[PDB]
């Protein structure tokens, strides 16, 4: 189907404890494939997926050089942000950035992204046109004016339409055995009495990839959205994900409840029930 590539940067100042830490990770879909950490004993862009290891020393040296330069840039940006928000040099602050490209099944660009945050709040975002910006506040408007003057969007557009999609296509081919394989969830319903007149039904989904999934409970065919407990999708550690959805039901009414599972690894949505 469709695929994405994303880079995530976190830059964290820590006055009195050295220069700000810079961590970058790269993903293809829900698969991390590179990392960089400025606190490492020997900071380098390093592989985190088997299919990236075949890239040669020119690749790794170029990525490492870029990450070291980007760490310096974001250290400068943290100092600039203090001036833009009238903040002191005593506190710890965080810049985050996410950028990358989405492609369709034919490999063509679907849309590009380049969005940043300061202290966990939106700061500035490249619009979907890859030509204009949305600034969240009057500080980010200062950045916007600077980036409009320097035609930054044109350079990001050239990356997002060009090298971003070209490298993503390469990674998808080199990792085709995993990146282009969906693993459907293994599903079952468990039953736990709470009391003599109520019980929990919990619908489980295990072992699935990618992480996107929908788990819904129906009672007499009506969605129980406002009455369902849904945990956050969580990683198993083997590339797969897990999720469950639970409802509290009157004892003797369990068979009126059905769990519905949608996932791209399933040819059709699945309907399941408690099987005593």
């Amino acid at each position: 189907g469709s695929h994405s590539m994303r880079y995530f940067y976190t830059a964290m100042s820590r006055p009195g404890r050295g220069e700000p830490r810079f961590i970058a990770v790269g993903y293809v879909d829900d698969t991390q494939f590179v990392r960089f950490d400025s606190d490492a004993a020997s900071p380098r862009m390093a592989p985190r997926a088997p299919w990236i290891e075949q890239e040669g020393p020119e690749y790794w040296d170029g990525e490492t050089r870029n990450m070291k330069a980007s760490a310096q840039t974001y250290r400068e940006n943290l100092r600039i942000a203090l001036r833009y928000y009238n903040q002191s040099e005593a506190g710890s602050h965080i810049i985050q950035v996410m950028y990358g490209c989405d492609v369709g099944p034919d490999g063509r660009l679907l849309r590009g992204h380049d969005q940043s945050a300061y202290d966990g709040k939106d700061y500035i975002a490249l619009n979907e046109d890859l030509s204009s910006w949305t600034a969240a506040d009057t500080a980010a408007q200062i950045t916007q004016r600077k980036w409009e003057a320097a035609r930054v969007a044109e350079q990001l557009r050239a990356y997002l339409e060009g090298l971003c999609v070209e490298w993503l296509r390469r990674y998808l081919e080199n990792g085709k055995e995993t990146l282009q394989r969906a693993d459907p969830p293994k599903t079952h319903v468990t039953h736990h009495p709470i009391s003599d007149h109520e019980a929990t039904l919990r619908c489980w989904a295990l072992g699935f990839y990618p992480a996107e999934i929908t788990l819904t409970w129906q009672r007499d065919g009506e969605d129980q959205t406002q009455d369902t407990e849904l945990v956050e999708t969580r990683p198993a550690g083997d590339r797969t994900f897990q999720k469950w959805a639970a409802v509290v039901v009157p004892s003797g009414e369990e068979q009126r409840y059905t769990c519905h599972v949608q996932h791209e690894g399933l040819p059709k949505p699945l309907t399941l029930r408690w099987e005593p």
């Binding site: 790269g26 840039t73 940006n77 600077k146 320097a150 350079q155 990001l156």
Partner: peptide
């Protein structure tokens, strides 16, 4: 492949 920074904030 990552892209290069263009301009500071």
């Amino acid at each position: 492949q990552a892209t290069q920074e263009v301009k500071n904030w």
